[PDB]
Amino acid sequence: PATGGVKKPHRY
Amino acid sequence: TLNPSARIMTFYPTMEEFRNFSRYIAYIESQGAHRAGLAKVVPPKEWKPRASYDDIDDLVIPAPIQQLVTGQSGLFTQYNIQKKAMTVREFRKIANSDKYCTPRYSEFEELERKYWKNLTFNPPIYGADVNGTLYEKHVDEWNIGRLRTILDLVEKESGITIEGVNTPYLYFGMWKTSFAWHTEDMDLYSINYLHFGEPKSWYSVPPEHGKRLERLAKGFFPGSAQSCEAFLRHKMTLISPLMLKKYGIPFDKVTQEAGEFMITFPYGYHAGFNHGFNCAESTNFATRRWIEYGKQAVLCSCRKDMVKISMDVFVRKFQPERYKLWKAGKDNTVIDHTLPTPEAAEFLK
Ligand SMILES: O=C(O)CC[C@@H](O)C(=O)O
Ligand code: NI
Ligand SMILES: [Zn+2]
């Protein structure tokens, strides 16, 4: 989709 | 002429000026605050977002991260390892424990020296990016959960929620926990309030010199740049001020104390570290000036879940005369980082 996601960065 | 030194400015609004958020942001920009890419705002002494922070020990930190850092000569890469969930009281016990507590020091410069000297040792735990707010629902001024800026158009028109961006995030830090160099997602503004605890120090590069930092970073991490042009958005890159100075990258530093707000501006690069146990609340926001930045933001597409915001709704509504050209991919506007946002015209006459 055009707008979405999350601020939190991918963790390990 | 408005802060040609591009240094970080601090503002002290009266309760009357403090009431209208977007209006005050427009004001500080009319004073040249955006040039440094970072500005501090001390709220009027009467204002308080919450009566007491003694009732949150049972608050859970779902995904604490241990910050492993590898590097040398002022250049580092940070690997955030997810650890088991824990409550604030548990985090506090570890934060204040003899193993992770703030080392003794005299002046800030000394603590800063200790940070850059020991950042790769004894990896700390950061209770970062936690969904939630500590504001009391009746606080209408500078309420991070409801700032009322045009960024609200995203949720209002597409009903899309981007956690941390159009919703608040809490950050429980301890000594030596860090945030890598980056600009906000979609190069938006950000608001950061330190609820309580020890200080949080910041480094900032003027937006008008942002490219120089990207250029420098690309040179230091060629492989990372090869895999992704916007690799800095991965938030894993740490660069010491000594390296910035050595390569001629302009920057400034400031320490945020409990009860103070920090505002980051579009395309303003920043990084920092926490002095000890503390808690901060943050989220993103926008103004009319941001629109052009959003349209030109360099994005990361080498990863899933990265924040992406369609600029169509903003161009259509605020730049209807440029909309057709933009959709055709012919909008060639050039951003002038020194110019204040339109809403500031009011304070410039
Ligand atoms: O507290 C932090 O981890 C950094 C927050 C800072 O990047 C912001 O823009 O709010
Ligand atoms: Ni930030
Ligand atoms: Zn990427």
Side-chain angles (χ1 to χ4, degrees), chain A, chain B residues 1-6 8-15 17-44 46-47 49-83 85-103 105-108 110-147 149-225 227-307 309-349:
Chain A
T3 299
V6 59
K7 179 175 168 174
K8 185 176 68 175
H10 156 268
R11 313 304 208 200
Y12 290 110
Chain B
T1 308
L2 298 165
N3 187 55
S5 53
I8 300 169
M9 302 169 67
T10 298
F11 299 84
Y12 297 77
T14 63
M15 186 53 87
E17 305 174 296
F18 197 66
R19 291 194 174 79
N20 191 326
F21 181 77
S22 66
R23 189 188 187 183
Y24 198 65
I25 296 299
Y27 168 64
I28 66 175
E29 292 203 342
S30 77
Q31 307 301 290
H34 57 298
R35 302 193 68 173
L38 176 62
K40 171 183 298 183
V41 179
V42 178
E46 323 90 65
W47 187 84
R50 191 194 186 72
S52 172
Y53 300 93
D54 301 313
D55 67 325
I56 67 168
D57 281 45
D58 287 299
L59 185 65
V60 182
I61 296 174
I65 57 166
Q66 182 152 47
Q67 306 190 301
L68 305 177
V69 180
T70 178
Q72 63 183 311
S73 303
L75 307 175
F76 315 82
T77 297
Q78 177 168 269
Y79 291 80
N80 296 311
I81 317 309
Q82 197 178 307
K83 308 302 291 298
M86 67 178 95
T87 56
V88 175
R89 67 166 70 76
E90 299 190 298
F91 183 85
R92 185 199 297 106
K93 287 290 179 181
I94 302 177
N96 293 314
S97 72
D98 289 329
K99 191 183 180 183
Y100 300 89
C101 74
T102 313
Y105 77 99
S106 182
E107 58 285 296
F108 165 74
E110 190 188 316
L111 186 68
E112 172 180 36
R113 283 196 288 282
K114 288 185 187 296
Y115 168 73
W116 289 105
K117 181 183 184 55
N118 304 304
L119 79 170
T120 74
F121 307 141
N122 186 47
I125 308 301
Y126 199 5
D129 303 288
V130 173
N131 282 306
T133 177
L134 291 183
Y135 276 68
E136 299 182 310
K137 59 175 179 295
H138 62 74
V139 185
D140 298 322
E141 312 78 43
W142 291 51
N143 187 315
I144 296 181
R146 50 188 171 90
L147 297 180
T149 72
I150 61 175
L151 178 61
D152 298 336
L153 273 186
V154 184
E155 197 285 312
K156 302 287 188 55
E157 311 264 307
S158 75
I160 295 170
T161 290
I162 303 175
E163 303 190 324
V165 183
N166 48 23
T167 69
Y169 263 9
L170 294 176
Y171 295 82
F172 297 88
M174 67 174 62
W175 162 237
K176 224 158 58 59
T177 54
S178 333
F179 54 102
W181 283 101
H182 67 292
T183 58
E184 299 312 298
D185 287 296
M186 293 306 294
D187 293 339
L188 280 157
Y189 287 73
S190 82
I191 178 167
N192 188 294
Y193 180 70
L194 193 55
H195 280 293
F196 63 81
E198 301 310 303
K200 182 194 291 296
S201 285
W202 302 65
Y203 296 98
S204 184
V205 169
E208 51 197 296
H209 295 304
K211 285 302 170 202
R212 294 171 71 175
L213 179 63
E214 298 189 347
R215 208 174 306 159
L216 200 71
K218 176 183 167 69
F220 298 139
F221 310 84
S224 299
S227 296
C228 174
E229 183 192 351
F231 79 96
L232 286 177
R233 295 195 184 279
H234 298 171
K235 294 182 179 184
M236 293 171 79
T237 309
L238 302 179
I239 305 170
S240 74
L242 286 178
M243 279 298 268
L244 291 190
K245 187 186 175 183
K246 184 187 178 67
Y247 291 81
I249 307 300
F251 72 96
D252 197 8
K253 56 190 72 182
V254 62
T255 300
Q256 170 187 26
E257 311 279 310
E260 309 185 320
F261 285 93
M262 294 306 303
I263 297 296
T264 73
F265 304 77
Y267 201 55
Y269 274 99
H270 50 284
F273 63 86
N274 295 301
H275 296 196
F277 176 62
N278 62 24
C279 169
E281 187 169 333
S282 179
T283 196
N284 293 114
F285 70 89
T287 67
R288 295 167 58 186
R289 189 165 74 73
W290 165 72
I291 302 178
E292 201 57 48
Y293 286 81
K295 292 164 63 189
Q296 298 192 38
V298 181
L299 305 180
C300 162
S301 54
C302 78
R303 294 183 171 188
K304 308 84 169 299
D305 303 314
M306 293 303 291
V307 174
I309 297 177
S310 174
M311 293 304 300
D312 188 286
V313 68
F314 294 93
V315 182
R316 199 185 300 200
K317 180 178 188 172
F318 301 96
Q319 315 177 333
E321 77 289 345
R322 302 197 61 72
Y323 186 75
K324 193 172 188 177
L325 202 84
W326 178 71
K327 264 191 64 178
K330 300 160 63 64
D331 197 321
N332 302 298
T333 310
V334 181
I335 300 173
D336 177 7
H337 305 296
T338 59
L339 302 180
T341 191
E343 303 95 304
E346 178 203 311
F347 306 91
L348 303 164
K349 63 254 287 186

